[PDB]
Design a protein around this ligand. Sequence first.
Ligand SMILES: [Ca+2]
Ligand SMILES: [Ca+2]
Lengths: 81, 339, 294
Amino acid sequence: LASLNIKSMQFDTTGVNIPIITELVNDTNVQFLDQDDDDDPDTELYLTQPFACGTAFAVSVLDSLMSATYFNDNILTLIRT
Amino acid sequence: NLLSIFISTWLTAAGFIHLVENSGDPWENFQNNQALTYWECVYLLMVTMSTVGYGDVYAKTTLGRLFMVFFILGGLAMFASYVPEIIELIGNRKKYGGSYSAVSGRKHIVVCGHITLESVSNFLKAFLHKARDDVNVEIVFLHNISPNLELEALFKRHFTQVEFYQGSVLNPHDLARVKIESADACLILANKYCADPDAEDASNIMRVISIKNYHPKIRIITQMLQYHNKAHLLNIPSWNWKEGDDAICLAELKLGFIAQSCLAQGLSTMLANLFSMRSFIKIEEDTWQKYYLEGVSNEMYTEYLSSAFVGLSFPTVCELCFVKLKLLMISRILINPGN
Amino acid sequence: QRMWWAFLASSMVTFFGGLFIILLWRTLKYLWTMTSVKDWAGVMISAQTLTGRVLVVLVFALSIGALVIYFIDSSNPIESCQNFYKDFTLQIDMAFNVFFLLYFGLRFIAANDKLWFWLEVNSVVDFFTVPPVFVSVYLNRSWLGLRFLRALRLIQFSEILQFLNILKTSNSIKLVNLLSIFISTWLTAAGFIHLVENSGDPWENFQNNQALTYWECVYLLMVTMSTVGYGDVYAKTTLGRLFMVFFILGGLAMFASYVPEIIELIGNRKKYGGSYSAVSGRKHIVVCGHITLE
Ligand SMILES: [Ca+2]
Ligand SMILES: [Ca+2]
């Protein structure tokens, strides 16, 4: 709701260009963040427009980090740096 | 898997019993041979495992009888073990899972939200009213709960207009199924008799958010139980209320009726009778009911003023616009036109 | 000789020709490879209009009459060459089936999608029973055949009880719907088994025919589906045994699928719905409020 509140700002200008990043506990809800996107439930989170534009971020994207750091621990340290 | 395993057991038992019967038991020098065909043995297996036990075809050999006993026991045990899977598999049936067809030259609307028997019944009574002109707009419904039997009977009574579909409003597939894009407007009902009305208001907010996400240019009529929730609803980028995105807030409207009747007694009842489309009924016995029914027969209508009444003469016409037209009417808005 | 070829071929080729004709709406016009009258029929086949309400009652009455005529003919031999104008039975059934034919045509004109309309069980019965009776006078002989399928029309009875105000309890309407379905499937299965057994399988040159009356066959099916299996009567022909096995499977499957209905109907008996009758001279006191055991 607030993201949509920010997108509907009006000062003099419009608030659509304002940078917004939103945490989501459910990756499905990303469809409501933007209106130009083609709402395809089959499409995974990474292919969604808000995620591709760097305006949405869930924690499911960090689930593969377990496998990534199992196959190579060093990369995790890189993130820690 | 269950069908294949049942068929395999059936055929294997039929073959084994056919082999046993067509070759008599060795204890009597193979003198118990019975002319039984394989398909007759299949028929015997069916008539002995459905428990029908016709007794027309029987297993005469001792080995045949022994295996018949043991494998009746085993087959009944296996069927009893498979009962839970049969029970759980059958229960999953779909009541009205389908899609809506767009009839050319026909308008239609879709209703979502809190759907119950009483709410739907009241909505149909208010919508499909005989006194109002012929209502030709198809009515489509949608809910996450399968319709009840009496709901299906009611929809059968209104088979011409009303037709149910099953789905979730938040799912774009369901919205595309009932052709949300082609509908004139979408109606969202709210559970006024629900615990914690804030949760219901927020739920309706999500419903309208999803509908606007699918199709920004759709007319939305929704019910809000608070005013701060209405202000929240105003914040949606596509929530343009200028041309018909009306949000009927029951709480503030009802309290306003109460306050207006406080200002002038009996105002709420006259407003409610005016807005409600009531079929006028005339009774003969001389009571106040006759006059009350005559007073509530009046309804509400709107129309844009004509050329003769539009040239800098709105209130002056409003002085005597009524005796010759037998009606009553009230820049931005028309409220008590004066001088 | 026998003449079942005419009736069977008529019915099957009617089905196939209809399926092919309707199926070519997109197959032929694969990217180029009125309504006012049409939906008018839709307001007649439906129950909204007064003529529509009358129509279904006539449908049920004619179906019942046809079933009675089928029983009467089943009391007679399987086939016989007879003049149409002699007896009084060969024309009343024609009236029944031509009324059903015009009802079918009214549905067909109003059919929204004729492809799915062609796969409707009522229409299946209609054009499985009408071509045989049409050709039964083009050859002037009788053939019981699939004339028992009319019994499948008993499933509409409950809907007709929607209009007659005899029954007003929804649960009782569901109960009568279940009873009608059970009776219809029972009678149709009895007709099928009677037809199959009264004339032996063709590959045996009709030499193993078993003399079974229709009511005896009804008793046979009732015994079979109660899982009693007396063995007094049974299917001797190979086709009889095969269909007996198939319909045992089908009947047990349908009964299993109907267990929740039996559960939700039987047991939901209301406690009290009547009114206390006042005994003259004897008073009474009404105790209400917190009514618990203690
Ligand atoms: Ca979207
Ligand atoms: Ca009126």
